[PDB]
């Protein structure tokens, strides 16, 4: 885990778009969760 006081440990200068690519977030269809109906 990164220190919340050091953005450098958790932020990025990489364009957001360019990031969502190399992680397959676009090609990724919406997620699903099974929920017991009760």
């Amino acid at each position: 885990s990164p220190n919340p006081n050091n953005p450098a440990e958790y932020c990025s200068t990489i364009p957001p778009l360019q990031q969502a690519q190399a992680s397959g977030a676009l090609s990724s269809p919406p997620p699903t969760v099974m929920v017991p109906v009760g």
Binding site: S1, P2, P4, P7, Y10, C11, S12, T13, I14, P15, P16, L17, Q19, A20, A25, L26, S28, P30, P31, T32, V33, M34, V35, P36, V37, G38
Partner: protein, 197 residues
């Protein structure tokens, strides 16, 4: 028994409310597009840009207006694959209180981090969200209703708040906003529904 509930991307993925200290200011801005900004420009807002330069607050004091001058380009917001980033375009850092972020990173609950200029941050990981949602489902209603808190993110321009801070609450910050991730909220509703049949 176990019926699948899928996340569904909303038309308007989030709504934004602006605040000057404890006073809400302006009307609620609704995000329809993938990439927009919330700035302080004196231009009329639109589908892609939520300007604040034109917002009046009869009780606005010197401190608020002075800070309001530094929002500037503000923050660029992006929604993609249910992922949400916030890029500080402004020349003044921005601060974020995202429950989702605090969840990963293992930070203390309620923490507010700084997104300095030129930087961005994935304020919402829809997957990580699904994982919790998944896990939560198996702990009943309350457990799940708890994730609603995660669909609300607050951010303040220029000045930050939190523990270790001078300003302890968001309500004591000159210029802030609150977003509501509709995607997650809808999905959270649907879920409770299926649990509440």
């Amino acid at each position: 028994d176990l019926q699948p509930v899928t996340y569904c991307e909303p038309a308007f993925w989030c709504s934004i409310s602006y605040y000057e200290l404890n006073q809400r200011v302006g009307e609620t801005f609704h995000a329809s597009q993938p990439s927009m900004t919330v700035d302080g420009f004196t231009d009329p807002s639109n589908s892609e840009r939520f300007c604040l330069g034109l917002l009046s607050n009869v009780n606005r004091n010197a401190a608020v207006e002075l800070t309001r001058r530094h929002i500037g380009r503000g923050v660029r917001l992006y929604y993609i694959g249910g992922e949400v980033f916030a890029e500080c375009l402004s020349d003044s850092a921005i601060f974020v209180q995202s429950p989702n972020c605090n969840q990963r990173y293992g930070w203390h609950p309620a923490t507010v981090c700084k997104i300095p200029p030129g930087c961005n941050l994935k304020i919402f990981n829809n997957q990580e969200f699904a994982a919790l949602l998944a896990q939560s489902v198996n702990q009943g209603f309350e457990a799940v209703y708890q994730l609603t808190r995660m669909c609300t993110i607050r951010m303040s321009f220029v000045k930050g708040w939190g523990a270790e801070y001078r300003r302890q609450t968001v309500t004591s910050t000159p210029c802030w906003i609150e977003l509501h991730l509709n995607g997650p909220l809808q999905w959270l509703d649907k879920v409770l529904t299926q649990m509440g049949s």
